[PDB]
């Protein structure tokens, strides 16, 4: 059983590697100048945003530059473009979770719906240090200070994610830990609206056992790391709660700020 729990971890780490192009391993090498890649372009004020804007991945009817008079609205559109691709990567990963695709498709939809943003915020910490965040697969680096200075409410979106990441990155997890942890998150039995709770909770309890063995081998000498990590799962939920409230400011105060249809589908009747 100890060998099967270790085989499950390898299955997850491998599916993680096929599913997420920018891992924590590669992001850490960028953020510490350990790569041979030239450094990401740094967006730190209005002028460097305009200078580096062509580096933000964005594909639309017109270039990101011409999406709005307001820099903050362009940042919003750029980050939304990434979120849709992030959802797609998390769904491919979820399908490799053993047992997931044998579950009632209705529950599969529910677990994706509630869990994707919690995973986005988890993995976003991999792309952060205390001063900013990698964007567009490591090609750019947008500073915390710059994001905080966008006119309200745009200036309020990233700061709680940076707050969470500095505390979360202090746990020094690696990609192999993270693969199991995001699986645990997805298979959460208390998602509102689950039809058959039991196979879900059965899979998650086995993922947790694999995670506990994983953290014990990979981080001996980090007492109670498993317990510190389970406490962040509830942090993820508050981050989602507050983020949803800021989106609701945007649809109520800004003119024509419909979300991408896939994000609309995810937030429709969420809690």
């Amino acid at each position: 059983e100890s060998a099967d729990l270790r085989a499950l971890a390898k299955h997850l780490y491998d599916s993680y590697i096929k599913s997420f192009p920018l891992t924590k391993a590669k992001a850490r090498a960028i953020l510490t100048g350990k790569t041979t890649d030239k450094s990401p372009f740094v967006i730190y004020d209005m002028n460097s945003l305009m200078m580096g804007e062509d580096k933000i991945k964005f594909k639309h009817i017109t270039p990101l530059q011409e999406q709005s008079k307001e820099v903050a609205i362009r940042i919003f559109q750029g980050c939304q473009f990434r979120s849709v691709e992030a959802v797609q990567e998390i769904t491919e990963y979820a399908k490799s979770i053993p047992g997931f695709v044998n579950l009632d498709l209705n529950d599969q939809v529910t677990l994706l719906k509630y869990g994707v943003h919690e995973i986005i915020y988890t993995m976003l910490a991999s792309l952060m240090n205390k001063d900013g965040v990698l964007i567009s697969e490591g090609q750019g680096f947008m500073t915390r200070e710059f994001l905080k200075s966008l006119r309200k409410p745009f200036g309020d979106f990233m700061e709680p994610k940076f707050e969470f990441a500095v505390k979360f990155n202090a746990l020094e997890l690696d990609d192999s830990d993270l693969a199991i942890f995001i699986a645990v998150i997805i298979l959460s039995g208390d998602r509102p609206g689950l039809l058959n709770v039991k196979p879900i909770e059965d899979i998650q309890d086995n993922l947790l056992q694999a995670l506990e063995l994983q953290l014990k081998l990979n981080h001996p000498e980090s007492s109670q790391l498993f317990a510190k990590l389970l406490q962040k799962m509830t942090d993820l939920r508050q981050i989602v709660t507050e983020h949803v409230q800021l989106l609701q400011v945007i649809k109520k105060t800004e003119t024509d700020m419909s979300l991408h249809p896939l994000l609309q589908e995810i937030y429709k009747d969420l809690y």
């Binding site: 769904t91 399908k95 498709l105 209705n106 939809v109 719906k113 589908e265 995810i266 009747d269």
Partner: peptide, 15 residues
């Protein structure tokens, strides 16, 4: 919601 209200997630979910 459900399969009912999530065409896109179901699309992502199928093979």
């Amino acid at each position: 919601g459900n399969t009912k209200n999530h065409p896109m997630l179901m699309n992502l979910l199928k093979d």
